[PDB]
């Protein structure tokens, strides 16, 4: 820091250097490229992947009216362009970019856009040292949020990435099923295939999920923003979950409980997602009220027998304990609903697709680690189990699953063993429900007897 | 009515037919937990022990620890030929424990309670009584090894402070009762083992605790939850010095005191049993 | 730290000392070097650690005239402590 | 000042007392009963005295002459040998010995005067409990103290010469930065990877340290010597600021320090939380005032509730301002939850200046496959091709089924199946000119400018696109059905060739009409079957 | 009910034999997989996770502990009427909104749901099922997790009329006395009150300790408003239903004669003028009109006969009625004929009651029934 | 104000009366394009009444226009939709929303 940068090339190589800056804008803010030795100094779309000196530089658009005519003219934006000491290049912008060479107003360049972003950038052949160097309100007012704050702020994220021409990206798994019939040349695909992909809105550009895992500081960031998102929902905060329900999205959680190319920390991130922007409230609501124990004396809760005519999946359910109401989200106008039926299936159903395959012992293996295959998966069930979701006769496949009577008998990491130690303990709560149900009815009907003896007195 | 009968009922026989005893099982769990790099309870005392070494300041009631330590605790010229065999049988109770550490737990955990009475230090010490109870004297060699070992000062510390609490006869309570013994007797019978067997370098470690940085004189201790209790016991007298015949709720309510003055001198001979 | 005037302006004796940890020959040195409280004899190096912040008394490296300054090195190794 | 005093502060550095015997020499020998000493207090490093300005006094060391500061202890009140060189016999014992205090030369007792301060005076006879018995100090604590004691005298010299250069532009500095790094490791936390009873000692040991520099105030002056630090984004000379970076970085890594183990410590900053966010954003330092941050929010949850919006709007700004972190994310998760109870406004608020903006954090939803098959041909006169479509189900899985039929030029333009240019999708690079789909219209540079049509019907099983080009001149317009769609495209790139693409999503079957018309216009103009003329034969890749 | 239990003393009516069969399938194949597995996990590795010990050896004692699982569970189960089960639905779901509240705008929430509470039919006719849910201790836990407004007032309500409605669920808030009194920095007191009332058994089992506080709080008093709450908490205690209990009676008194902490003419110009003040000296009065070896007590209530006129007063200061009636109440139980005559002022009152065509309507009844005193030229 | 654009044509004859239960499929993402909404997303149709004002004023008049069958833009004015207050957590203050409603059904 008047807040500017040095540079220089000390190498045998001068090639290509494509500065584009990693700070865009939408829609004064003066953008000045000093030079002390021509230079290409313009701002540039967000989509740019031309590695070329062939300058320059690489678009007009027209609306008719029923016949041609005018009410036609737009933008021309790729984008912006320039051309024995030092040199100043400056780039003030609100709207409509303006040009001032060496402190002269000589602009009437490309300048017109309806609300797009613009990385500042600067495209240069190295004339070796000191090369370039940078900066009516500064433009740090105006590219981050705290607008408009005149004084000029240098910023960390002031990045200068150079375009690289070879940057490596995924190579997809199963995609779409090519056709093309040479009956009149009739191109045809069918069954449909969906990235788990995300955009980085900063300097707007996609990519999938699924290639994420080699950015491993990416999936370091947006792991923690998922636990971020878990963190908001915490206990009842319905208020924003309905908030979050716009944030990812329902069909994301289910790929994201579907795909096994998603890496780990993120996978038991969107596990816990599922288990705090929908099915977490309700089952913390369901914990106190299952240990009360309270029971009525209605004719399906007289029965109880205890022993079957034993098994921890019996179907007497009976107590009271109040459903979990869930109002669906909508943004037209607290608490969040979910395909329930639907996704129970879905949870059977991974935790089937992994104690097989886990039981073929796979080094996949699935989430990168055993931990990240059966944790957010048995936490889920869990929690799910617990919710009193299932029909008892998907407890029976659970303990199928488990007892054998496959996955219990199996040696386990300890996170999972943990997780499988909670929900086995779900299944000895169970247990003690049946108990202490079997016999409130048999002091129900015990109560019948006795009573009848009372009035013998 | 109907629901009203039933929840009677039920009450009622919480307080009956459920006792009975299915309690018997407490040595084949703690059996099944010796079956072979550290054992099940093993594992269970060490966790027990980690938890009292973490600065939870005041304690939680945590039921899981008073499960096992009651757990534990439930654990432990032919009748001399069988009453030496049921010592053996007892000391291999014991060995099944402070082996595994279990002085250990005991001790940490009764320096973890600080001054705090609740129904933790009760079980806690109802632990080292069963770990002891014989005069046993390898669990006292593990425990004043520790104690000289880890330099832990609070353990005196915590046990100046529950005599310093604990209960007297009292004089005022009782008219409101006209109109809690147990863990004391629990505390001084468990330091009144850990010198029978008569360990001279542990009672003289009472005496003054030599290391540590803060000197505690806990012989003194005890006696003075003894004077204040005599000084209850005077008062109990006068108070029915004129009336002759006693109350029964004025007899179990001194038979109360007396066992506890009883346990207390006996403490106070095994603190100078030895010469 | 000086002391001569013991009167008006006492000296700030709490970091004046120093324990002798260890005292060896000069060739016993060695041994230990390359790999109770008995009295000290002339001849022998002593080690000198310090009463309060604990480091050991050792010639240093950097200077202040040739003369290395004086110092209180962490730890034990080394020959100059 | 000086008091007797219960409760809570026996733990305290402040109430701590070193003996210190006239003797130069044998300073260690027992404590016998008379022997003159000069009492010090161990945090001030102040001797005790008596004085006539001020009767009883502490006061400092060069003030202290011997008669006037010195004392003896008396087993009762009696006013009743030499110095031995030896260690002499036996005697104080911390715990049997009631010691009265007498002073040396006036031979007053000490007694006290008569809310729990109660201050201590001298006295020739006083109340019966003048015997205070001497209590040892751990000689951890003890360290501590002393190290205090240096510690308040260097950043006292210290902040008084940031003041000697403060106002007006134009003493200690690597002393300091070596202290402050001897202090953070003095501060280091136990490693976790160490078994768990040590590490708990060690730990409870770093809560008494942590405490007893802040019952001293040492974080108080810490926090004053990174407030005085602030002034400066660069007075002193070029050598004693050019370490400042250094010395203020590790004030926030010291000042952090401190906090990670206590919930007081960070609930003294309670009122010093504004500040805090307030050099957030200084950019300079910035990690470590981040991690304090961090640091206090963990375990302070009464400091959650003193958070506003204001603050929030700082963190949040202050991750515009340094890129991503997930450091700074955590934060956001600290102040969302205490110690487990939760925080809702707070949540609220994070929520409100965070998420609504989506234009900050990563963002993310499931996409459908954009693809497209060229025919083959490649196209440098003017040319002309049809584009019939037999299916489509456009709102199949989630996204309409995109079917954006154009051109592209070879020397750019490259549709990797996903990722790439917001969202994937056709038209996303400037070198591509579809048509089609939502309102018909164009796609360049992924902009949806919406141009009008007689009808503005989208792509059905039965559309026929009817697409335009020309050589030279590089007006381009593409139709529906034969209808008319306005004048689009003008003036663009005539290098390499342009070839038809016709993308797809999802379950879609489209007819290219190329040669074997169902419908041709002599508008353009030229059949692009024409252009399959080269030598490889027409076939779509 | 103890009846029943004589029909479940069954085990040392041929139906005790069903009952037989009953427990002996109570004694009880998810055992030895749990019990077995577990002790697998333990044997073969130590396991190193604390939270995941923590709950291996929580299975592994529910397992074996067959019998006593039930035990610690029947207390919280309890049996309810068909027909008016959905009043419970109503209840816990309502319960469950504080309980989220436990961990923590929300304040309009749970006042709401505590007045739904108030509401329900479920709640008079089982108060052991109230109890059992610990609902109170919730409701009392988030009072206490606010201190350190309006809400708090709404859950005093609440714990109030849960005092009120049964004596032995009046036990459960007795037991939070001292803690409610730590609470006190001041209605809470209103509370520990309506938990001292009705059972005189309570009355006495209470510790001296939380009067000592009581009267602390009183000594905090050296300027008050707080004053006439505290004698009022007092008052409740000692008097209980109408018998002077000598045990907490004696106890107050000589707390109260150490930290007290001329006075009648500060109640003479109270009377000329801060309607507090008279009111503490009423309800102070009152106080030691509640309260009668023990002999002692009454003669240092004689020292404080300086009444009488403060009655005189109060009939010239028509505010009165309350006052003057705790200046009779002391005069009754502190303190023959002819004196009853010098007293007799009361006659004036009577020709004021007929002003009621007000305050004096009050007045008129609070002096027909304390018209019974004087019962007793 | 509102400004409603048609996409593609239904039926072209039904349009919506007061108190109909609606039946539709939208999305919705702001004028930067970003979504913020899906109804396809949670693959369940959301049936609304129209007139009942539950929904925001621009969704309440814009469906009229719309015919059963029917794809239509909506370009929503803020003052119709959230206008200064933006819905918490998910539209800023002052935004336009941009949907691409399909109006199923009528009941």
Redesign the interface.
């Known amino acids: 820091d008047l807040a500017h940068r040095t540079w220089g090339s000390q190498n045998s190589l001068v090639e290509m250097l494509f500065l584009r800056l990693s700070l865009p804008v939408q829609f004064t803010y003066y953008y000045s490229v000093r030079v002390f030795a021509c230079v290409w100094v313009g701002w540039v779309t967000p989509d740019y992947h031309q590695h070329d000196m062939n300058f320059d530089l690489s678009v007009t658009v027209t609306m008719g009216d029923e016949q041609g005519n005018v009410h036609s003219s737009l933008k021309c934006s790729n984008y912006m362009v320039w051309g024995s000491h030092t040199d100043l290049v400056i780039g003030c912008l609100v709207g409509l970019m303006t040009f001032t060479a060496n402190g002269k107003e000589s602009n009437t360049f490309f300048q017109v856009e309806p609300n797009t972003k613009l990385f500042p950038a600067v495209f240069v052949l190295p004339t070796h040292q000191n090369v370039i160097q940078f900066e009516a309100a500064m433009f740090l007012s105006e590219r981050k949020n705290p607008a408009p704050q005149c004084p000029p702020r240098l910023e960390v994220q002031m990045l200068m990435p150079v375009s690289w021409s070879r940057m490596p990206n995924h190579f997809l798994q199963v995609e779409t099923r090519r056709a093309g019939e040479r009956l009149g040349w009739a191109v045809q695909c069918q069954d449909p295939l969906t990235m788990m992909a995300l955009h980085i809105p900063e300097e707007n550009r996609c990519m999938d999920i699924l290639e994420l895992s080699e950015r491993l500081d990416l999936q370091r960031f947006h792991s923690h923003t998922l636990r971020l998102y878990r963190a908001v929902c915490a206990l009842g905060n319905n208020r924003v979950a309905h908030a979050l329900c716009s944030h990812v999205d329902q069909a994301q959680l289910l790929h994201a409980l579907e795909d096994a190319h998603l890496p780990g920390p993120l996978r038991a991130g969107y596990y816990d997602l599922l288990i705090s922007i929908h099915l977490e409230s309700a089952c913390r609501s369901r914990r106190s009220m299952l240990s009360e124990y309270i029971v009525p004396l209605t004719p399906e809760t007289r029965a109880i027998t205890l022993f079957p005519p034993g098994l921890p999946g019996v179907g007497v359910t009976t107590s009271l304990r109040p459903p979990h109401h869930f109002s669906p989200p909508c943004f037209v106008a607290l608490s969040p609903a979910i395909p329930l039926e639907a996704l129970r299936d879905k949870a059977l159903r991974m935790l089937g697709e992994a104690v097989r395959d886990g039981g073929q012992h796979a080094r996949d293996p699935v989430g990168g680690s055993v931990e990240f295959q059966f944790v957010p998966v048995l936490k889920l069930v869990s929690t799910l189990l617990v919710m009193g979701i299932f029909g008892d006769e998907d407890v029976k496949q659970i303990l199928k699953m488990i007892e054998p009577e496959g996955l219990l008998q199996m040696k386990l990491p300890e996170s999972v063993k943990l997780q499988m130690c909670n929900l086995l303990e779900y299944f000895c709560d169970q247990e003690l429900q049946h108990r202490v149900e079997s016999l409130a009815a048999f002091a129900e009907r015990y109560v019948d007897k006795l009573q009848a003896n009372q009035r013998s007195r | ?3 009203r ?10 307080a ?3 006792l ?1 005893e ?2 018997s ?2 040595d ?2 703690i059996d ?2 010796s ?6 309870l093993h ?2 005392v060490l ?1 027990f022990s ?2 009292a ?3 939870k300041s005041k304690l939680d009631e945590d039921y ?1 620890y008073m ?2 330590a009651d757990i534990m605790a439930k654990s432990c010229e032919v009748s001399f030929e069988e009453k030496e065999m049921e010592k053996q049988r007892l000391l291999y109770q014991q060995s099944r424990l402070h082996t595994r550490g279990a002085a250990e737990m005991v001790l940490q955990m009764i320096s973890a309670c600080k001054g705090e009475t609740g129904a933790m230090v009760s079980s806690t010490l109802k632990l080292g009584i069963s770990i002891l109870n014989g005069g046993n004297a390898e669990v006292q060699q593990k425990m004043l090894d520790y104690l000289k070992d ?1 330099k832990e000062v609070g353990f005196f510390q915590s046990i100046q402070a529950l005599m310093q609490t604990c209960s007297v006869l009292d004089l ?1 309570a009782f ?2 009762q006209n ?1 809690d013994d147990e863990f004391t007797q629990d505390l001084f019978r468990f330091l009144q083992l850990l010198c029978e067997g008569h360990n001279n370098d542990f009672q003289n470690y009472l005496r ?1 605790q030599t290391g540590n ?3 505690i ?1 806990i012989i003194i201790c005890t006696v003075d939850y003894l004077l204040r209790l005599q000084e209850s016991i005077s008062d109990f007298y006068w108070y029915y010095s004129g009336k002759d015949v006693i109350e029964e709720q004025g007899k179990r309510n001194f038979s109360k005191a007396m066992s506890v003055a009883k346990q207390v001198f006996n403490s106070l001979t095994e603190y100078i049993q030895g010469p | 730290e000086p002391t001569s005037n013991a009167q008006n302006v006492p000296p700030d004796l709490a970091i004046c000392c120093f324990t002798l940890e260890q005292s060896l020959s000069v060739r016993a040195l060695q041994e230990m070097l390359a790999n109770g409280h008995r009295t000290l004899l002339y001849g022998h190096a002593i080690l000198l650690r310090h009463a309060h912040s604990r480091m050991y008394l050792s010639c240093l490296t950097t200077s202040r005239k040739l003369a290395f300054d004086v110092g209180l090195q962490e730890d034990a190794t080394g020959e100059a402590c | 000042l000086v008091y007797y005093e219960g409760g809570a502060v026996c733990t305290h550095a402040r109430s701590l007392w070193r003996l210190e015997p006239l003797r130069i020499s044998w300073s260690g020998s027992h404590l016998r009963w008379g022997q003159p000493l000069r009492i010090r207090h161990v945090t001030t490093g102040r001797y005790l005295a008596l004085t006539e300005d001020q009767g009883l006094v502490v006061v400092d060391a060069c003030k202290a002459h011997t008669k006037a500061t010195s004392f003896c202890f008396r087993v009762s009140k009696e006013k009743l040998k030499r110095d031995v060189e030896g260690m002499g016999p036996p005697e104080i014992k911390y715990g049997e010995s009631l010691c009265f205090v007498q002073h040396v030369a006036s031979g007053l007792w000490l007694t006290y005067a008569a809310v729990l301060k109660k201050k201590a005076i001298l006295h020739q006879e006083g109340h019966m409990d003048d015997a205070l018995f001497l209590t040892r100090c751990q000689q951890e604590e003890s360290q501590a103290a002393r190290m205090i004691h240096s510690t308040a005298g260097l950043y006292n010299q210290f902040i008084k010469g940031l003041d000697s250069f403060s106002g007006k532009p134009r003493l200690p500095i690597e002393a300091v930065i070596l202290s402050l790094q001897d202090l953070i490791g003095y501060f280091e936390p136990p490693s976790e990877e160490l078994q768990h009873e040590e590490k708990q000692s060690k730990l409870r040991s770093l809560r008494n340290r942590q405490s007893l520099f802040q019952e001293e105030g040492m974080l108080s002056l810490v926090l004053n010597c990174i407030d005085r630090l602030n002034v400066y984004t660069t007075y002193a000379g070029e050598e004693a600021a050019e370490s400042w970076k250094e010395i203020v970085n590790l004030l926030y890594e010291l000042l952090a320090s401190l906090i990670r183990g206590n919930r007081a410590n960070c609930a003294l900053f309670s009122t010093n939380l504004d500040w805090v966010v307030s050099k957030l954003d200084r950019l300079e330092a910035s990690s470590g005032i981040l991690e304090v941050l961090y640091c206090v929010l963990i375990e302070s949850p009464e400091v959650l509730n003193i958070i506003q919006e204001n603050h929030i709007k700082s963190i949040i700004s202050l991750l515009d301002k340094h890129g991503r972190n997930h450091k700074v994310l955590d934060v956001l998760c600290s102040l969302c939850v205490c110690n487990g109870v939760a925080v809702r406004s707070n949540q609220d608020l994070i929520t409100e200046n965070l998420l609504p903006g989506r234009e900050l954090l990563l963002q993310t939803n499931l996409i459908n496959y954009v693809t497209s098959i060229r025919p083959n041909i490649f196209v440098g006169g003017k040319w002309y091709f049809e584009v019939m479509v037999d299916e489509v189900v456009p709102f199949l899985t989630a996204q309409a089924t995109h079917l954006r039929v154009g051109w592209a030029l070879t020397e750019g333009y490259s549709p990797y199946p996903g990722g790439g240019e917001g969202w994937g999708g056709n038209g996303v690079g400037d070198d591509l000119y579809s048509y089609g789909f939502d309102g018909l219209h164009l796609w360049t540079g992924h902009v949806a400018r919406p141009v009008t049509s007689p009808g503005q019907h989208l792509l059905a099983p039965e559309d026929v696109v009817s697409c335009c080009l020309d050589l030279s001149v590089p007006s381009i317009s593409f139709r529906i059905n034969g209808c008319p769609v306005q004048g689009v495209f003008e003036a663009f790139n005539l290098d390499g060739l342009f070839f038809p693409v016709v993308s797809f999503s999802a379950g879609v079957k489209v007819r290219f009409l190329l040669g074997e018309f169902k419908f041709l216009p002599p508008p353009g103009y030229a059949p692009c079957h024409e252009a399959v003329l080269p030598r490889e034969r027409l076939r779509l890749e | 009910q103890d009846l029943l239990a004589h029909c479940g003393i069954q085990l040392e009516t041929s139906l005790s034999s069903r009952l037989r069969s009953l427990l002996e399938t109570v004694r009880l194949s998810l055992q030895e997989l749990v019990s077995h597995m577990v002790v697998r996990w333990a044997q073969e590795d130590y396991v190193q996770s604390p939270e995941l010990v923590r709950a291996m050896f929580s299975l592994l004692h529910r397992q074996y502990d067959g019998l006593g699982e039930l035990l610690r569970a029947l207390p919280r189960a309890y049996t309810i009427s068909p027909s008016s089960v959905e009043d419970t639905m109503s209840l816990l779901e309502c319960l469950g909104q504080i309980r989220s509240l436990l961990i923590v705008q929300e304040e309009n929430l749970m006042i709401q749901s505590i007045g739904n509470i108030m509401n329900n039919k479920v709640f008079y006719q089982h108060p052991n099922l109230m109890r059992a849910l610990g609902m109170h201790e919730t409701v009392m836990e988030v009072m206490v997790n606010v201190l350190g407004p309006k809400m708090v007032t709404s859950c005093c309500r609440f714990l109030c009329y849960f005092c009120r409605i049964s004596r032995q669920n009046q036990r459960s808030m007795f037991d939070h006395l001292s803690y409610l009194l730590e609470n006190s920095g001041i209605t809470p007191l209103d509370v520990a009150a309506a938990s001292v009332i009705d059972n005189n058994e309570l009355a006495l089992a209470l510790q001296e300790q939380d009067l000592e506080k009581v009267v602390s709080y009183l000594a905090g008093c050296g300027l008050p408003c707080g004053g006439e709450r505290y004698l009022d908490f007092l008052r409740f205690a000692v008097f209980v239903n109408g018998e002077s209990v000598e045990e907490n009676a004696n106890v107050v008194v000589r707390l109260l004669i150490r930290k007290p902490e001329g006075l009648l003419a500060a109640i003479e110009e109270a009377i000329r003028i801060g309607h507090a003040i008279m009111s503490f000296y009423a309800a102070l009065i009152d106080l030691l009109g509640r309260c009668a070896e023990a002999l002692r007590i009454r003669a240092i209530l004689r020292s404080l006969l300086d009444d009488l006129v403060g009655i005189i007063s109060l009939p010239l200061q028509i505010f009165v009625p309350d006052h003057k009636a705790s200046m009779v109440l002391f005069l009754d139980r502190v303190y023959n004929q002819d004196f009853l005559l010098h007293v007799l002022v009361g006659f004036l009152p009577d020709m004021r009651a007929a002003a009621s065509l007000t305050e004096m309507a009050l007045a008129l009844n609070r002096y027909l029934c304390l018209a019974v005193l004087p019962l007793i030229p | 104000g509102v400004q409603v654009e048609t996409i593609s044509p239904g039926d072209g004859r039904t349009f919506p009366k007061r108190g109909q239960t609606c039946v539709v499929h939208y999305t919705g993402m702001l004028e930067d394009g970003k979504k913020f909404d899906s109804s396809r997303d949670r693959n369940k149709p959301f049936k609304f009444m129209l007139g009942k004002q539950e929904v925001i004023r621009g969704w309440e008049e814009g469906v009229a226009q719309m015919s059963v069958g029917q794809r239509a833009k909506l370009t929503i004015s803020p003052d119709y939709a959230y206008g200064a207050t933006g819905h918490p957590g998910i539209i800023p203050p002052h935004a336009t929303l941009v949907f691409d409603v399909e109006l199923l059904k009528l009941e």
């Open positions: 009515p109907t629901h009968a039933c929840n009677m009922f039920l009450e009622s026989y919480k009956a037919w459920i009975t299915d309690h099982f407490e084949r769990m099944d937990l079956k072979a790099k550290p054992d099940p594992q269970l966790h980690r938890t070494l973490t600065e899981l499960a096992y880890k005022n008219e409101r109109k003054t940085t803060t000197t004189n």
